[PDB]
Paper text:
D2-[name] is a GH3 β-glucosidase from the indigenous Taiwanese fungus [name]. Endo-glucanases (EC 3.2.1.4) break down internal 1,4 β-glycosidic bonds in the cellulose chain, and exo-glucanases (including β-1,4-glucan cellobiohydrolase EC 3.2.1.91 and 1,4-β-d-glucan glucohydrolase EC 3.2.1.74) digest the chain endings to release cellobiose.
There are three intra-domain disulfide bonds involving residues C39–C55, C199–C210 and C369–C374. Three N-glycosylation sites (N68, N205 and N273) were determined by the presence of N-acetylglucosamine after endoglycosidase H (Endo H) treatment, and one O-linked mannose was observed on residue T431. The N68 and T431 glycosylation sites have not been observed in crystal structures of other reported GH3 β-glucosidases. In D2-[name], residues D232 and E442 are nucleophile and general acid/base residues, respectively. D58, R122, K155, H156 and W233 form the substrate-binding subsite −1. The hydrophobic substrate-binding subsite +1 is formed by W34, Y444 and F256. Structure alignment revealed that all key amino acid residues lie in the same positions for both D2-[name] and AaBGL1, except for the phenylalanine involved in substrate-binding subsite +1 (i.e., F256 in D2-[name] and F305 in AaBGL1), in which the two aromatic rings have different orientations. The connection loop between the TIM barrel-like domain and the α/β sandwich is shorter in D2-[name] than in AaBGL1 (12 a.a. from residues 307 to 318 vs 29 a.a. from residues 356 to 384). This loop plays a role in forming protein dimer in AaBGL1, but we did not observe that dimerization state for the D2-[name] crystal structure. Another short loop is close to the active site entry region in D2-[name] (3 a.a. from residues 166 to 168), which may influence the efficiency of enzyme catalysis by broadening the active site pocket.
Author numbering: 1 to 713
Write the structure that this text describes.
Amino acid sequence: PGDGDWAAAYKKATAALAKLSNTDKASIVTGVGWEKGPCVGNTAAVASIGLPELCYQDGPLGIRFVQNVTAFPTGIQTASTWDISLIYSRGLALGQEAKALGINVQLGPVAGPIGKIPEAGRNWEGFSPDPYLNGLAMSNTITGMQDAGVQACAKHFIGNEQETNRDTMSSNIDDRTFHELYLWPFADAIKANVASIMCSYNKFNETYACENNFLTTILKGELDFQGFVVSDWAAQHTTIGSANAGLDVAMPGDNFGDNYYLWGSNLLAAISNGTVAQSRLDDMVTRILASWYFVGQDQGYPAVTWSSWNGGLGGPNVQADHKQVARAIARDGIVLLTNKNKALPLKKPASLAIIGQDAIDNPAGINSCSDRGCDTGHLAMGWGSGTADFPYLVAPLDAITPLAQAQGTKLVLSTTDSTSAAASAAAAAETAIVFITADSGEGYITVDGQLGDRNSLAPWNNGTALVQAVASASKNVIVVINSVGPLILEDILALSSVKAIVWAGVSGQESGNGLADILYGSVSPSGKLPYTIAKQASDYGTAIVPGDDNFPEGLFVDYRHFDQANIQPRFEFGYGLSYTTFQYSQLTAKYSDTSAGSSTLAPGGPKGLYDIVATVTAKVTNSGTVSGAEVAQLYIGLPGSAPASPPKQLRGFDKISLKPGKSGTVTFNLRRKDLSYWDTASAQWVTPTSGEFSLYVGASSRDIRLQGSLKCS
Ligand SMILES: *[C@@H]1O[C@H](CO)[C@@H](O)[C@H](O)[C@H]1NC(C)=O
Ligand SMILES: *[C@@H]1O[C@H](CO)[C@@H](O)[C@H](O)[C@H]1NC(C)=O
Ligand SMILES: *[C@@H]1O[C@H](CO)[C@@H](O)[C@H](O)[C@H]1NC(C)=O
Ligand SMILES: *[C@H]1O[C@H](CO)[C@@H](O)[C@H](O)[C@@H]1O
């Protein structure tokens, strides 16, 4: 208790605990019931310690239900920027809104799923199937949010990698894979002093996550987590199991509104009858209060004056200037995939056809589908709990129209997905931009026959067939794709008239502004893929399973698999084009700390794991004729002394903006953990001590420009 930065918080918490009755304690750990409070979850106020009715509110990309809030870009769009400054700023901006509404706990960001299964329906909420990128995104988002004064909640712990049967299936993950891959972003989150972690709906090793003692042995033991664990909604199964496993808060308290509470008086009964220790409830409360005090919510926090259930009305307008970071991520997370002799940026075309319903806002209304449970009109968010009501949505045509008008280009509109009207409009313009999508969401909503998870890696809404129609009647086609995740693009790429493919992602309210910022060339695209785009779906080596998942692929997920199995992707992890080119030189690598690392336990694990032990640099030069930013990447290969591992693992990235002909330095600081592996034999992290690490610096997981090594001492 009080390890790391939490000692003053725990002191305040322990003092408060001493004033509480057992009924006070029970009310702090037991949600009031589904929809009974104004938030997605609440616990009762405890006036004797000045504790409010704690407010838990969705979701990761904006405040759910409440009006006059910002609908920020998705997690995966945010990761696609590879820009820690933007990542931090989105978290700050979200947390500013949450605090201003009196939200105590904002339910994000998302470390689980990482997205090991490309079809899985919630992967867009997260931060990629690369644990290093994911972890940097987690820590910068949390630090932002909590700097604004809200408690963040890293979710969903753990192994909820598909929506299909998520509340009955088991994920059974071997020790090494668990630590190196799926745990890794949660460990970064804990090191960044995340206030809370939510346990998942699925079984892990055959026991429900919220009933599994790993909450105590891994989160609170190995990782020395000082905050509190909250259930996913109605993910608690038993009174005694959950308490004893290490759950701290049961949300929403009952089984989605059934008025039956496994904790409440039932938990007091379990204590009275000897099956749960008083010390366990005391520990739960101490943790919840510690997190409250840790982010400073005990003095001068705003009150909730709105409800989730009355249309989201009653609160102040909290949008502030947050559209700025929303636009910057909508822009800078776009990934340019192809661009044949400078098709883009556009430059005063005489005429332009605009094709696809994705070009315009949903004609029925941008918030007309409950929880964004449709793929109709412009797609800027997936569906489920990780949503918000758009205050407005800039569709591509909204942004393009004035820009085209100023250049006197004529627009030929075909804003449905009709293939005949599409070919018709394509024939009538010099250049055609066609807009296609792919969507998915949380597994309580079915859209186009898909209950959360996607049933293929094909474009939705007959998108491939739309593009084929446009290509059949035009010599100059630009494809814009708004998708929640990887798609197989081989049919589109086989079309000789497709001159540029813009992977624009799913980017919130400012989507169409960010897109135009790139299409008309005000800014060079600088995004890089945060997942692999394969040539066929079977190449990922993962898929949605019908029963339990034993994770046989182990460590080898996304590019790690393509690399280990020698499968050429179509577009690799970390790939992205620019309107310029970059050249890399001058690699340096230096061990700055060859010592033994501290074994004193702190949140995140042994403190020495996070010491900076080495630094790598390189020089990057803009070799082209326009300005652009490049995302330099560092991949590490472990020595032969280590067990068999992916050939390359991302361990650094740095984004540099350069004017034409200019040069700068990129820097990658390596933690001891970044140079380690999990040794199941000794049940700990090992840092190799003979041989040499291989260092690969370049523009992608496969566009490696520099190579070096770090002697392992
Ligand atoms: C899950 O089961 C695997 C294989 O049995 C086991 O070795 C691993 O340690 C388990 N992890 C737990 C309980 O956290
Ligand atoms: C203890 O109380 C809990 C909560 O009501 C109940 O489920 C359990 O059956 C009780 N056990 C015994 C041995 O009384
Ligand atoms: C949003 O805020 C504006 C600006 O204060 C206000 O006039 C408008 O009524 C608010 N809308 C809702 C639904 O509260
Ligand atoms: C429309 O726009 C494209 C892309 O800029 C051009 O390459 C084409 O010639 C047409 O003008």
